[PDB]
Design a protein around this ligand. Structure first.
Ligand code: GDP
Ligand code: MG
Length: 337
């Protein structure tokens, strides 16, 4: 049966801090009688931690920043003054992220709940100052090196945003235009004719997954099991975008097309049909600006659609970034609960 999965992947480098070094010193004070060793120990190096964050949706930021370095521990000083510990680094990933050690290929951990932490690079240990060698010792040790590790990060992706619409509305054009990356498909016998998913990156820590719903529900290569598995994680889907070709040359009338799409949606699933749904009119580049607005207002009027709708050209980019920021806003404002 149906096993297709979409997997987000990133490879990053994590480097913990080295230990600070030990110090060699002695108290040589005029009436305070002895030689007295007094060199302090170094500080331990800083650690690298991964932390699960339920507000992140994808691993997209780790395609761009790929290297993380915690701080070296401080050297020891006189008066048995032990060096300050090096500062830690925490790297945030979505809930569901599996963390693999790419050197050894072993799974280090799975980030299954909010605020959960995983140590991925242990900092070096402090050097010892001469005070530790006592029986007037002139020896000290250096701090040990911080772990250096390449991590493979893997995350099964579920749709945050669904596209709806007729064939040739511009759904895959839209998806490809907004996508910073295409996730890899796993457990699917074929390699062609995959439904369209994309990861949208708006800015740091601000991303979402967009999917073409008809590709998923039509059991095109995987059969009817795929749409059921889509429905299984529907709670991750915050909003649907009903994409409408504003002037179909195919002669078709946008109002009736819109009605067929709605009706098919309601038949398939009542939860899917009650999701927030926004009208988005596409291919406005073909028309003059004011004419597009008329045509759109008229279609909205005829559907009894009272909400705000959008006008865009998925081809040229007109209105697309504004739409994506409104989707990002909605997402940030409606976390899954
Ligand atoms: N002129 C124009 N053509 C578009 C726009 N969006 C999509 N198209 C074209 O319409 C056709 C259908 O788009 P596609 O993304 O394949 O539709 P889908 O079937 O909904 O995935 C393609 O030839 C696109 O290049 C647009 O904003 N303007
Ligand atoms: Mg297509």
């Amino acid at each position: 049966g149906s096993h297709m999965k979409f997997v987000d992947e990133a490879s990053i480098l994590v480097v913990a801090g080295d230990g600070g070094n030990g110090c060699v010193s002695f108290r040589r004070e005029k009436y305070i009688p002895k030689g007295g060793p007094d060199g302090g120990d170094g500080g331990d190096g800083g650690d690298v931690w991964m932390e699960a964050d339920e507000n992140l949706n994808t691993l997209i930021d780790y395609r761009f920043e790929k290297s993380f370095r915690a701080e070296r521990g401080q050297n020891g000083a006189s008066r048995d003054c032990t060096g300050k510990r090096g500062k830690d680094v925490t790297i945030k990933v979505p809930v569901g992220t599996r963390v693999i050690d790419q050197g050894t290929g072993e799974t280090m951990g799975d980030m299954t709940k909010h605020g959960q932490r995983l140590l991925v690079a242990k900092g070096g240990w402090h050097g010892l100052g001469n005070t530790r060698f006592k029986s007037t010792p002139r020896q000290k040790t250096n701090g040990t090196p911080g772990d250096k590790r390449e991590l493979l990060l893997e995350l099964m992706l579920l749709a945050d945003v669904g596209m709806l619409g007729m064939p040739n509305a511009g759904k895959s054009t839209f998806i490809r235009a907004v996508s910073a990356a295409k996730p890899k498909v796993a457990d699917y016998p074929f390699t062609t004719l995959v439904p369209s998913l994309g990861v949208v990156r708006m800015d740091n820590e601000k991303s979402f997954v967009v999917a073409d719903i008809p590709g998923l529900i039509e059991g095109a290569a995987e059969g009817a099991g795929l749409g059921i598995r889509f429905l299984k994680h529907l709670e991750r889907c915050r909003v649907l975008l009903h994409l409408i070709d504003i002037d179909p040359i195919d002669g078709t009338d946008p109002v009736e097309n819109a009605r067929i799409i709605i009706s098919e949606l309601e038949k398939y699933s009542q939860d899917l049909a009650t999701k927030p749904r926004w009208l988005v009119f596409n291919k406005i580049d073909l028309l003059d600006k004011v004419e597009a607005e008329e045509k759109a207002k008229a279609i909205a009027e005829a559907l009894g659609w009272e909400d705000k709708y959008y006008l865009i050209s998925a081809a040229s980019g007109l209105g697309v970034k504004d739409l994506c920021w409104d989707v990002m806003t909605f997402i940030i404002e409606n976390p899954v609960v």
